[PDB]
Design a protein around this ligand. Structure first.
Ligand SMILES: [K+]
Ligand SMILES: [K+]
Ligand SMILES: [K+]
Ligand SMILES: [K+]
Ligand SMILES: [K+]
Ligand SMILES: [K+]
Ligand SMILES: [K+]
Ligand SMILES: [K+]
Ligand SMILES: [K+]
Ligand SMILES: [K+]
Ligand SMILES: [K+]
Ligand SMILES: [K+]
Ligand SMILES: [K+]
Ligand SMILES: [K+]
Ligand SMILES: [K+]
Ligand SMILES: [K+]
Ligand SMILES: [K+]
Ligand SMILES: [K+]
Ligand SMILES: [K+]
Ligand SMILES: [K+]
Ligand SMILES: [K+]
Ligand SMILES: [K+]
Ligand SMILES: [K+]
Ligand SMILES: [K+]
Ligand SMILES: [K+]
Ligand SMILES: [K+]
Ligand SMILES: [K+]
Ligand SMILES: [Mg+2]
Ligand SMILES: [Mg+2]
Ligand SMILES: [Mg+2]
Ligand SMILES: [Mg+2]
Ligand SMILES: [Mg+2]
Ligand SMILES: [Mg+2]
Ligand SMILES: [Mg+2]
Ligand SMILES: [Mg+2]
Ligand SMILES: [Mg+2]
Ligand SMILES: [Mg+2]
Ligand SMILES: [Mg+2]
Ligand SMILES: [Mg+2]
Ligand SMILES: [Mg+2]
Ligand SMILES: [Mg+2]
Ligand SMILES: [Mg+2]
Ligand SMILES: [Mg+2]
Ligand SMILES: [Mg+2]
Ligand SMILES: [Mg+2]
Ligand SMILES: [Mg+2]
Ligand SMILES: [Mg+2]
Ligand SMILES: [Mg+2]
Ligand SMILES: [Mg+2]
Ligand SMILES: [Mg+2]
Ligand SMILES: [Mg+2]
Ligand SMILES: [Mg+2]
Ligand SMILES: [Mg+2]
Ligand SMILES: [Mg+2]
Ligand SMILES: [Mg+2]
Ligand SMILES: [Mg+2]
Ligand SMILES: [Mg+2]
Ligand SMILES: [Mg+2]
Ligand SMILES: [Mg+2]
Ligand SMILES: [Mg+2]
Ligand SMILES: [Mg+2]
Ligand SMILES: [Mg+2]
Ligand SMILES: [Mg+2]
Ligand SMILES: [Mg+2]
Ligand SMILES: [Mg+2]
Ligand SMILES: [Mg+2]
Ligand SMILES: [Mg+2]
Ligand SMILES: [Mg+2]
Ligand SMILES: [Mg+2]
Ligand SMILES: [Mg+2]
Ligand SMILES: [Mg+2]
Ligand SMILES: [Mg+2]
Ligand SMILES: [Mg+2]
Ligand SMILES: [Mg+2]
Ligand SMILES: [Mg+2]
Ligand SMILES: [Mg+2]
Ligand SMILES: [Mg+2]
Ligand SMILES: [Mg+2]
Ligand SMILES: [Mg+2]
Ligand SMILES: [Mg+2]
Ligand SMILES: [Mg+2]
Ligand SMILES: [Mg+2]
Ligand SMILES: [Mg+2]
Ligand SMILES: [Mg+2]
Ligand SMILES: [Mg+2]
Ligand SMILES: [Mg+2]
Ligand SMILES: [Mg+2]
Ligand SMILES: [Mg+2]
Ligand SMILES: [Mg+2]
Ligand SMILES: [Mg+2]
Ligand SMILES: [Mg+2]
Ligand SMILES: [Mg+2]
Ligand SMILES: [Mg+2]
Ligand SMILES: [Mg+2]
Ligand SMILES: [Mg+2]
Ligand SMILES: [Mg+2]
Ligand SMILES: [Mg+2]
Ligand SMILES: [Mg+2]
Ligand SMILES: [Mg+2]
Ligand SMILES: [Mg+2]
Ligand SMILES: [Mg+2]
Ligand SMILES: [Mg+2]
Ligand SMILES: [Mg+2]
Ligand SMILES: [Mg+2]
Ligand SMILES: [Mg+2]
Ligand SMILES: [Mg+2]
Ligand SMILES: [Mg+2]
Ligand SMILES: [Mg+2]
Ligand SMILES: [Mg+2]
Ligand SMILES: [Mg+2]
Ligand SMILES: [Mg+2]
Ligand SMILES: [Mg+2]
Ligand SMILES: [Mg+2]
Ligand SMILES: [Mg+2]
Ligand SMILES: [Mg+2]
Ligand SMILES: [Mg+2]
Ligand SMILES: [Mg+2]
Ligand SMILES: [Mg+2]
Ligand SMILES: [Mg+2]
Ligand SMILES: [Mg+2]
Ligand SMILES: [Mg+2]
Ligand SMILES: [Mg+2]
Ligand SMILES: [Mg+2]
Ligand SMILES: [Mg+2]
Ligand SMILES: [Mg+2]
Ligand SMILES: [Mg+2]
Ligand SMILES: [Mg+2]
Ligand SMILES: [Mg+2]
Ligand SMILES: [Mg+2]
Ligand SMILES: [Mg+2]
Ligand SMILES: [Mg+2]
Ligand SMILES: [Mg+2]
Ligand SMILES: [Mg+2]
Ligand SMILES: [Mg+2]
Ligand SMILES: [Mg+2]
Ligand SMILES: [Mg+2]
Ligand SMILES: [Mg+2]
Ligand SMILES: [Mg+2]
Ligand SMILES: [Mg+2]
Length: 116
RNA sequence: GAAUGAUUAACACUCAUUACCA
RNA sequence: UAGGGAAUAGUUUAAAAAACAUCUGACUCAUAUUCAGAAGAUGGAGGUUCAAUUCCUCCUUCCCUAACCA
RNA sequence: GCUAAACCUAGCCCCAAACCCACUCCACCUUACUACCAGACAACCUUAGCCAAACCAUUUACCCAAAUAAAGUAUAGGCGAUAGAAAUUGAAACCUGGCGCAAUAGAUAUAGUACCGCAAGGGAAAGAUGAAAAAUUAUAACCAAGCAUAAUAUAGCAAGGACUAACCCCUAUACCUUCUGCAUAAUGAAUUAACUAGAAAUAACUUUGCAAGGAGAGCCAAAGCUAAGACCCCCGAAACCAGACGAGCUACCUAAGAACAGCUAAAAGAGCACACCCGUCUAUGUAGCAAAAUAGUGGGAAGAUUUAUAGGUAGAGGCGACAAACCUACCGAGCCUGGUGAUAGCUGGUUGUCCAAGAUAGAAUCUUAGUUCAACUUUAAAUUUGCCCACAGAACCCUCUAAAUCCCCUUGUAAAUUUAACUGUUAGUCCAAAGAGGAACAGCUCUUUGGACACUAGGAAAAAACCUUGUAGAGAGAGUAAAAAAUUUAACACCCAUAGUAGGCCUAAAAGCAGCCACCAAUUAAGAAAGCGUUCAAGCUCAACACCCACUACCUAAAAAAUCCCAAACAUAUAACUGAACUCCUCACACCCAAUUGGACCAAUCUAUCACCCUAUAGAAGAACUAAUGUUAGUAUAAGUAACAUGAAAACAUUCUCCUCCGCAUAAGCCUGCGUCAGAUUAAAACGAACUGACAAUUAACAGCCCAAUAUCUACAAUCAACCAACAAGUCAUUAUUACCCUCACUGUCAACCCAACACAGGCAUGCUCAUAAGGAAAGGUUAAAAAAAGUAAAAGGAACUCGGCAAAUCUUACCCCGCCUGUUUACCAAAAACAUCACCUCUAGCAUCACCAGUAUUAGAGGCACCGCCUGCCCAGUGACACAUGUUUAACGGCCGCGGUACCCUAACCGUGCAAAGGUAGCAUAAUCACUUGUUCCUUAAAUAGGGACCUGUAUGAAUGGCUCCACGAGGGUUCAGCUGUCUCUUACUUUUAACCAGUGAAAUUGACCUGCCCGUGAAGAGGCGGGCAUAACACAGCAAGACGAGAAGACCCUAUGGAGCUUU
RNA sequence: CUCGGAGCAGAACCCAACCUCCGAGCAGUACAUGCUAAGACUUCACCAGUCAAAGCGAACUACUAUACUCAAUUGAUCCAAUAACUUGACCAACGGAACAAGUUACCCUAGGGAUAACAGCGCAAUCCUAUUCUAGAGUCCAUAUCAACAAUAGGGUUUACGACCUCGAUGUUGGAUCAGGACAUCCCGAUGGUGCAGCCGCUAUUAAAGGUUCGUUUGUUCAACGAUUAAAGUCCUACGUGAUCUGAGUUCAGACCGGAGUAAUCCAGGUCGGUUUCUAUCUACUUUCAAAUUCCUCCCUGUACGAAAGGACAAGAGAAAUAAGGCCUACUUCACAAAGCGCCUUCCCCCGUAAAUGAUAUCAUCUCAACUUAGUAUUAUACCCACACCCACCCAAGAACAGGGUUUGU
RNA sequence: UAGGGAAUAGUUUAAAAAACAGCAGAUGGAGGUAUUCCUCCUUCCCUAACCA
């Protein structure tokens, strides 16, 4: 019985974050429902979709979730993204995946309240 | 260590040169 | 096989200094001692920091310890 | 037919009621049960711990004076576990009963007896007629295991299907527990009978009552509330604490006793050697003679000796020449009782029938042998989707542009979620697939997806994990599913060869063929040469011509293990057939998973009411046993086995043979225990009797049982006590005065005997006998096998045996290590080098009326070391102790060095430099001293890892936790000369025992059941029991030890447990 | 030992190893990092953690301004401090006990084959063997002999690995005793090759009937050494065999030395000492009756061979050892007999190859062509073989039983 | 962490001086009415904490 060695690799024991899409294409969401969670921007917020401080995407309106591909124009103040687009060959357009909520209900209705 | 010179009255030294198991 | 420590001038130590050794001079008839001068160093490689012997990392050499119970 | 079986009483339990309490005479706290004398001692003083807190450390309910209620409230608490009031409230109360037991129950109880223990203390078993036994030839019978009547016939979990037929044929791997998985060679179990194990709240559910109320004050209430039904086991540690009991064993001590021949020396912890004490070595023995013995051999035996008697020290302790010894057979700390039903996440066990549902992501945890939450699983309830899935849709960065997934209408289907209430599972195996670790090893380890297994059946030889197949019954129908192993191998050309030229160059030589360049040309045809060869050449081939139909294939290679190959066989008759619990068929249908969960029934018993040859509806409960190394009893198996016993003849008078270990007596112990008579009860055999009943008996002079007061007295051992010389300094003695006229009581007295469970080869003090005047018998009979035991003798050799000369024989030499010596120790595996010890040294203490001590520093106590001889070096920084102003102290705890260079190499008188309290000094050294190591050399042997003497840096020797020499001593360890021998070469013969046979008597462990073969294979991985073969009428007796993973002891090694205990400690 | 990122885990989520890599236990800027509140996420439970519309109050009409940048950057309850707000652990064993280390070989109990040591089994890295390949060595020459880089198989003796049976026990080294088996043969037999003249060797094929020594030191298995031998084989059998033995070693309780430790005590160390039970129920077995192996001497022969030196084989003869089976005349132990140290007997084959003839293929060719020879045994033969006289007696027969004799039953 | 106290030349003292160390040299820092009055901060000491 010879004495053995030991592994020099510590840590690495974190559990899965359980991130990803919570509401798939066509699903009905109420306002506030989290649509997806992510560590980096895999899906970008579209129409009526808010983005949390932790990049969490949530519904701003009640409706149907839709995923589309759209042209990506960064904010002129986002230095890193602007540096990329300026170095692109002319004629080249960046695309990204966006998630939207199509509002299902109208903001309200006018109802007869009195006959004065 | 060897040879060679330099050195000495001649040497030694020194310097320089050469070639099982429970 | 596992573990801890160390590496500084040619030599041996210190927190970039002393000691001698080495070279220079003086004293001696000459040598030593002595006196006055002079030079010389942070095992290797990589990185942090404006700056690293002094913060970390791997390798080499060496040392010390353990390597058991039926 | 035996053994047995059966019984209904004895009494007992729980309540009620009631307060309770004895007495002849005599004896009884001293040694209890003892007629009768001078004393004066006197009682109180907090429970602890197990356990719970998942350890444990504060803490952890224990009637304390009225049931209920307030209330598990206030409050307390590692604010944890758990503990827990009061104010206030306020009831009933008629002993003579029982849905209690009925001889393993109920009290332990026929009895606190027998029996066990020194003691405290522990503590049984069992009986059965009838009206009458002054009816006893009575009261029938049938029933457990075990046997008998009546042994057995190839073959195999002992049966099943069957059959004319018991067997023969075919099929079939006991049971429980425990596991991933057990025929397993894993656990338990000889068998029978009896006994022997699920206790309850919180909620919820079900069924009644009443209902915004319910309830027979308290409580609850936004349909509640009241009542009922229905769920929560048994045995087991090592421990801990309290109070008693123990020093008749043993350790040590106190008082007063006893023993020690002979010889040598005559001085002796001196030698030889009895008694006596001890226990070195070997054999025997190992449920024995013996819970430590016997035989031989050994150590001691005038001393630190051995030993009888009484007394002392007691468990948080004693005692100890320290062995963790010994303290009543078992002491890392006694025993008993109690706390106590200690606790156990650990093993084992857990009792009627039938059906149903039912296999598993993970998280935390002093946690991974367990728990809680999730998940899965079960039941009840609610109302609404569940599952399968169409498009569309879900990322860039990056190398496998993976198999897929997610989402999802339709559709095919019938589930799903939610509410209420719980338990169990949370120690996992193989296969396919994607990977990781390892060795692209594992029946290996780790994740993922799926399957199977832990449930069925068929198949793959046997076969958990592969294939086929699942839903349950009957059938002497039927169709099928999976389902059988194929292959066979290496020929090959014939014929012929002149030449520019030995091409050029290089080279000693290079001539087709060491290298470099060219590679042209003669002959119809032949490379300025493709393979050999020659030192260079020669020489043999191939590519050429001619001859001429070689008319090639151009794909490939073996083998070996251990008990014995392994179905038998077969190349030839027409695609089929066989084959399940699948499916069909006639009839029927709840009727094949562990843990767990739901449900339907039910034996017997008691009670209410029925019933009335053994029942019904209900209510109850000590309500069901193929398993706990279970408890008690009975009887088997081993087994008529192991083992045990009586000297001979005779007229039972006596005599003979042989032992003598003794023997007689006293003390202690014991208590009628071989005397008579009468019984046939019996001695490990036997009708004499030690057993039963009765009747007798031991007679004091021996011994025990003693003494008026007060004061006073007592320097001068003993040893033949005389010479002589001692130390350890000793067992023996009065007087004065007063008082005192009396007599022979009382008790022990036996034996073949005590302590050891026994009629035990053991233990057991003293006197005398010293081999006997006393006391005894080794052989039940026979035979004369093996193996075994105890002896005797042995050719030639003489340690060649062996770890070792163990044992035996003979009887001796020299040396080494350790310890000075005599002595002491682990009673029962160690007798030693361990302890003690004379000697030496350190430390403490200036003193009296209970040890030390009736002592006083030349003393006493606490320690170290270990006579003597030579010695005991350096260090006080650290720790300790002492001392105080620094400090002192090692024969206190302890310690006592590097790195680099210099005489060729080894080495360094030497030199540099750092460190320290000091740097290991003298000695000794391959050691009983870490390895290296069988170091080197001399001696020893034919040969030596042995032994002796040296050399040694031992970098881990070393100086009172002592170093080194040396006399004497040693059942210490090692070596050796000589001799001796059956130790051996190499065994043999005889005797005794045992043995075997006959007769009597008659155990133990063990035992699931057995109808109890061998081979290969298989398998929970080593098969009498499975597969394939082979073998095979039946049954004794004697041997053997290869297997039955043989018996015996719940492995002492190892790990685990929030299990113990002893010891040490900063 | 807690936390985060990446791979394993390629595409929703999840996913382990004492697996592979890299990090964290802060820092910086704000000071509305103010208040409040729909709807959601969630590390597979809980605890904890995460994102947020609207609204209030601010800011604001220049600020990718509105839950700050940032991946992790962290700690429950009780309790303590504090007027309040609020703060407090490398509680890092990081779901955290308010506070507790050693040692036990003097040990104990409960369990575990859920887990080690022995053996089996699995596996074959390691170990051993064979073949393939043709570099190299062997003067030349690959293949007499040896052999690199590699390749393909086999073996199951080593050291490991795994943890499947066994811990209500499968007794652990070496030796004694008795051996069963494999052949990968050490000796003896039969053959091919040789860098084989001969004598000796080397290598390969075949052969497991028979055989395979005694001693000094060591506990040894081994190893060294002495002396022999035809040879002193390699292995398996629970590293065969302790209900047959042994107990030197190893591995309990005593003790010493060196070393470690404050000590208790301890060490792969060394050293002295240290209890080895069992009456056999079952299986199996208790005359495989009887063919023998080997060395040496003489002779062949100083022949064959060879320059010499040296020096055979076959046949023949003799004498021994061992083994097996018997026996007692003598010797010896002994004495109506049993014994050895004495005497007597002992018998067949071995298949690897070497050669003819002769086809496929009109030569040739020893032929998994037909065939011929070396070249083979029904292994030979041997032993055993007739039986109610049998009460009893005797016995060279024997445990009992059985057997022989009794014409040897006063 | 809490308070108490303290800070003079490199060092240690005095009431702006001497002594040592190497003619230089100082009133820890900031603010205020100046070593000498007060306050905050730094460093250090003292004393008590450092629990959960
Ligand atoms: K997110
Ligand atoms: K405990
Ligand atoms: K009783
Ligand atoms: K069982
Ligand atoms: K088995
Ligand atoms: K098993
Ligand atoms: K067992
Ligand atoms: K006493
Ligand atoms: K068990
Ligand atoms: K547990
Ligand atoms: K099949
Ligand atoms: K040439
Ligand atoms: K008596
Ligand atoms: K005895
Ligand atoms: K002794
Ligand atoms: K000191
Ligand atoms: K020696
Ligand atoms: K020597
Ligand atoms: K002795
Ligand atoms: K046997
Ligand atoms: K923890
Ligand atoms: K392996
Ligand atoms: K075991
Ligand atoms: K020996
Ligand atoms: K059997
Ligand atoms: K004899
Ligand atoms: K041919
Ligand atoms: Mg990860
Ligand atoms: Mg994880
Ligand atoms: Mg001159
Ligand atoms: Mg507890
Ligand atoms: Mg404990
Ligand atoms: Mg009250
Ligand atoms: Mg009773
Ligand atoms: Mg019967
Ligand atoms: Mg059969
Ligand atoms: Mg198992
Ligand atoms: Mg099975
Ligand atoms: Mg069994
Ligand atoms: Mg078990
Ligand atoms: Mg209950
Ligand atoms: Mg306690
Ligand atoms: Mg007590
Ligand atoms: Mg006594
Ligand atoms: Mg006395
Ligand atoms: Mg005498
Ligand atoms: Mg004496
Ligand atoms: Mg004597
Ligand atoms: Mg004593
Ligand atoms: Mg001791
Ligand atoms: Mg001891
Ligand atoms: Mg006792
Ligand atoms: Mg219990
Ligand atoms: Mg079912
Ligand atoms: Mg914890
Ligand atoms: Mg678990
Ligand atoms: Mg759907
Ligand atoms: Mg789980
Ligand atoms: Mg596995
Ligand atoms: Mg030519
Ligand atoms: Mg030429
Ligand atoms: Mg040429
Ligand atoms: Mg030619
Ligand atoms: Mg040539
Ligand atoms: Mg031509
Ligand atoms: Mg040709
Ligand atoms: Mg069916
Ligand atoms: Mg059916
Ligand atoms: Mg009935
Ligand atoms: Mg019952
Ligand atoms: Mg029963
Ligand atoms: Mg039982
Ligand atoms: Mg018997
Ligand atoms: Mg007998
Ligand atoms: Mg008298
Ligand atoms: Mg008498
Ligand atoms: Mg005695
Ligand atoms: Mg007599
Ligand atoms: Mg007798
Ligand atoms: Mg007898
Ligand atoms: Mg007899
Ligand atoms: Mg003899
Ligand atoms: Mg010998
Ligand atoms: Mg001798
Ligand atoms: Mg021998
Ligand atoms: Mg002897
Ligand atoms: Mg002694
Ligand atoms: Mg003893
Ligand atoms: Mg004794
Ligand atoms: Mg003894
Ligand atoms: Mg001693
Ligand atoms: Mg002395
Ligand atoms: Mg000293
Ligand atoms: Mg030198
Ligand atoms: Mg010295
Ligand atoms: Mg040594
Ligand atoms: Mg010897
Ligand atoms: Mg030392
Ligand atoms: Mg010493
Ligand atoms: Mg000392
Ligand atoms: Mg003496
Ligand atoms: Mg001696
Ligand atoms: Mg003695
Ligand atoms: Mg017998
Ligand atoms: Mg008999
Ligand atoms: Mg048994
Ligand atoms: Mg088998
Ligand atoms: Mg028999
Ligand atoms: Mg069996
Ligand atoms: Mg056994
Ligand atoms: Mg056990
Ligand atoms: Mg405890
Ligand atoms: Mg969650
Ligand atoms: Mg807002
Ligand atoms: Mg934790
Ligand atoms: Mg966590
Ligand atoms: Mg010991
Ligand atoms: Mg045990
Ligand atoms: Mg296992
Ligand atoms: Mg093993
Ligand atoms: Mg086995
Ligand atoms: Mg293999
Ligand atoms: Mg060559
Ligand atoms: Mg094997
Ligand atoms: Mg496993
Ligand atoms: Mg067993
Ligand atoms: Mg054999
Ligand atoms: Mg062979
Ligand atoms: Mg063996
Ligand atoms: Mg055996
Ligand atoms: Mg021994
Ligand atoms: Mg020691
Ligand atoms: Mg002894
Ligand atoms: Mg020993
Ligand atoms: Mg034995
Ligand atoms: Mg026997
Ligand atoms: Mg011949
Ligand atoms: Mg021919
Ligand atoms: Mg021909």
């Amino acid at each position: 019985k010879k004495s053995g060695g030991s592994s020099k690799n510590l840590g690495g024991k974190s559990s899965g974050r359980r991130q990803g899409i919570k509401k798939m294409e066509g699903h009905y969401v109420h306002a506030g429902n989290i649509i997806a969670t992510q560590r980096h921007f895999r899906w970008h917020p579209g129409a009526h979709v808010g983005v949390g401080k932790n990049k969490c995407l949530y519904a701003l309106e009640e409706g149907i979730v839709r995923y589309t591909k759209e042209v990506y124009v960064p904010h002129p103040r986002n230095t890193e993204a602007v540096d990329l687009i300026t170095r692109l060959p002319k004629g080249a357009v960046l695309y990204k995946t966006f998630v939207h909520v199509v509002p299902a209900k109208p903001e309200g209705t006018f109802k007869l309240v009195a006959m004065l």
